[PDB]
Amino acid sequence: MEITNPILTGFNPDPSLCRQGEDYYIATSTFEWFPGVRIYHSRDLKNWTLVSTPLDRVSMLDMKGNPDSGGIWAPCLSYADGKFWLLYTDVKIVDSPWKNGRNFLVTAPSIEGPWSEPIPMGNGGFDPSLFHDDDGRKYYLYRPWGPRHHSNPHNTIVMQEFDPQTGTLSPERKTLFTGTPLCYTEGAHLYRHAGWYYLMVAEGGTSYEHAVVVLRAKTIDGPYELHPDVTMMTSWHLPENPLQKSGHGSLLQTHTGEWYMAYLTSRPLRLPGVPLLASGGRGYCPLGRETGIARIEWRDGWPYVEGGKHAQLTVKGPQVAEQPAAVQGSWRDDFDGSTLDPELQTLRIPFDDTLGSLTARPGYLRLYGNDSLNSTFTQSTVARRWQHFIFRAETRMQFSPVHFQQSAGLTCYYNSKNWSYCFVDYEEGQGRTIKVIQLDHNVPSWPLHEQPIPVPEQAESVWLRVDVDRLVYRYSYSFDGETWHAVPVTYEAWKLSDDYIGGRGFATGAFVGLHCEDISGDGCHADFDYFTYEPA
Template identity: 50%
Template sequence: MTTIRNPILPGFNPDPAICRVEGDYYIATSTFEWFPGVQIHHSRDLVNWRLAGRPLDRKSQLDMRGNPDSCGVWAPALTYADGLFWLIYTDVKRRLGNFKDTHNYLVTAPSIEGPWSDPIYMNSSGFDPSLFHDDDGRKWFLNMVWDHRRRRTSFDGILLQEYLPQERRLAGPIKNVFKGSPLGLVEGPHLSKRNGWYYLTVAEGGTAYNHAVTMARSRTIDGPYDLHPNIHLITSKDDPDAPLQRAGHGFFVETDAGEVFHTHLCSRPLPGTKRSPLGRETAIQRVVWGEDGWLHLAQGGQVPAVEVDGPDLPPHPFPAEPERHEFDDGGLPSAFQWLRTPEPDRIFSLEARPGHLRLYGRESVGSWFEQALVARRQTSWFYSAETVVEFSPDTYQQLAGLICYYDRARFHYLAVSVADDGSRVLQVISSLGDHPDALMTYGLERDLPIPALGRVYLGVDVRLSELRFRWSEDGERWQSIGPVLDASILSDEAGPGAHGSFTGAFVGMAAHDLSGRALPADFDFFVYRDEPNPI
């Protein structure tokens, strides 16, 4: 029997919705403000996974310019029925304060590779939507409902309404079918049916350290729903020493052989802290149907395990992602994403200078509209990254280089710029979780002079909460630059405004031109490698 080691999708991959199509398994996860929207991973053995695509890749499907940090695509739900994949998602336009603007959409495709349709608007009453295909052919739409009045709680239950696919619209009565358990903050609904029971799986407790997977069931789709005898199927909230914390928000899938596995999000805080730069990751647990007709963790209890027995399926590994990307094949490597805009030609090009990624300096670091930042997820507590840039700024308003980024108030940036006298320099710039002002600090008492022309190699090494930049003129002889920086600020939990932050740490390339002249910066390669974990 194979062993599954969690998390199966390391780094920022939250809110996993799983579905099976014959021998193929797919997990859709949230991408928030990162474009293209929704990550879909594929497996044939539940052990090995590959990125199959990001379906929301054009303006008609998703335009997040102006979306604040940690808004955008929340909690997609992926199902398969009637020869189609059905993908439901929310585009969140506001998350802070009493109000949330949460617009829910549906796209479909005959294949996981597409083509994916233009979206059908569903509603805006809350977030975390999903679609259930009943065995009588009817389809039902669910989402949590947001109460801006906050008279009791803003999480006011789970709404249910019928969806008419022929008419491409919701219709009929809207019913609040489940108010949640005493834990509260009910969200993330998914429906299933077994032996005449409708099973409702939800997330509760908020997506921090009180998070949980809660189950309920009813003989009728609109309830009333009775709670699982343990209330929560999966949670780490009562075990602060569990390696997988913040466990909650997922769904289950059954193999052909009747084995059942349940996804959930989790985080791995840095030792001795409650900060998780890797963000909320995806894990999976073996579960079993008990004689009482409820799912239970196979290992007993409610706390998720790092290692679980895998399914009785042939191993199906995929080629490993390369550490080094040369930008020679005409397309952006799949590991990389950018922020918000559906018009990538305005922020980068792979054709303007063949063999290079050219970034066009746009708005400031942390802009919610048009920022030239192309990056990939941090997937380990220990990693190194390098790149090389050619960039000829003529004003201090122009910067380009290597960035470790969470959001506009949490980043570390090793940037090429110019001093007041016009000489080219290196700067170390950080924002240390300063919400809401996003004030910057500088890691060097004086900017470091570098040659006026030519390539500049930039690198970073992260070891747990320590982050150290380095640079080189030739890519062989490296020199450290700046102090040891705090890598833990690149996390959901860091900073006074951390509540309601939902993404994870990225590392990549950036260019900014506050003069408005879109000065280009050319990057010849990017290397990312996870280092051995000595812990």
């Protein structure tokens, strides 16, 4: 069996890999996108399909007003004592010398079954993890944040004992590790194999310096000794490697006795003429931080990645038959049923009658006019991940705005300060027109407002389409579905990436979605017949 990486394409960072018997699960972070956490299932480690979006109630995740790249960071999904355990962090500050957040524990006997009310696990840091030792005791790990605890200078891994019968954490903290010169020590996971406790952490930050560092000790509280190579996985030293930023590992032993590690990684696109190791020369990643997997071998009590430290595109799969669940390729929601397609997500808040409805006009997705795309509160935006470098997204829209503050259409979105948006609005002199708005480092670009493209009065529908092709992407429209016209504006797909945006936020990924807004608050709605995503 040959596994091609990434196993989870598009925005899918911080893979937490677990297993229940012969069923394997990975949980990835979702940041400000609702619902929180995405859980994928596989029986062969090669083909993964979404099976659970657990944090789908405000009582579990209340992310309105959360900053960009806040919300759900790295989760921990483990299985023990007949149920799954899910730890997650809701981060409330991002653009600051230090951050605040909240950690919670939810459990469920089955991966899709209803998850319990959250248990507060503290606020002192991020990357929470739960270790189930062989003696029945349980230990809660995390990396503390705060003043001087963002690698200025401190970045530590602490441990509290956890009582599962009372849901209590003991007030004592034991520092397990303080980090190597790479620093950014985070993502701690504990394992017990042979006579050793193994401590796996991420270091070097989640960009091109990302690495997986492993330590080991005889007792759980230390002292820990470094892996002889220090870093177990990294691709920093191979700048031409297809997979980059390989870190934040999650080690698992299969039911067949084999060893695999899930990790996050990114696939960069490079600009012509830029030296490879200059600033920005290593590339830009519109598909954000994705999830890969590597086969692990053991030598003299230490784990190694087969073939080398770097993330490889192809790895050797386990001793099982390939058992795919979902058909791959094209994607479309015709909005014929009761629920949005699970590949669609909202910004911060859940989808309900406030943002839209699937029953007001059956066969259409109706979106109500609320805030514009730059808002961290109430956007009627329904978006899905960029999962390929070349694809087309298309919709058919019916919309009748009455003034300039009502608009609706298609958007390619990264955060509230970096997106583009091709929409239909009303102009007081002409009528319905198509315009485009782009935010680039929070700087606006609206080149069609002075001379917009007229929408014919008799046009019952306005088809909208975006064609993404590596570094660029363009919008196109149609009033009959057969004859299309390009919006004469070329957009930079590489700008929809943390490599370009920068700041304190972490790389998520580019989305494409349907949006309708009414800054006036008067009230309006846009009906969308379908939404398509077709890879090349």
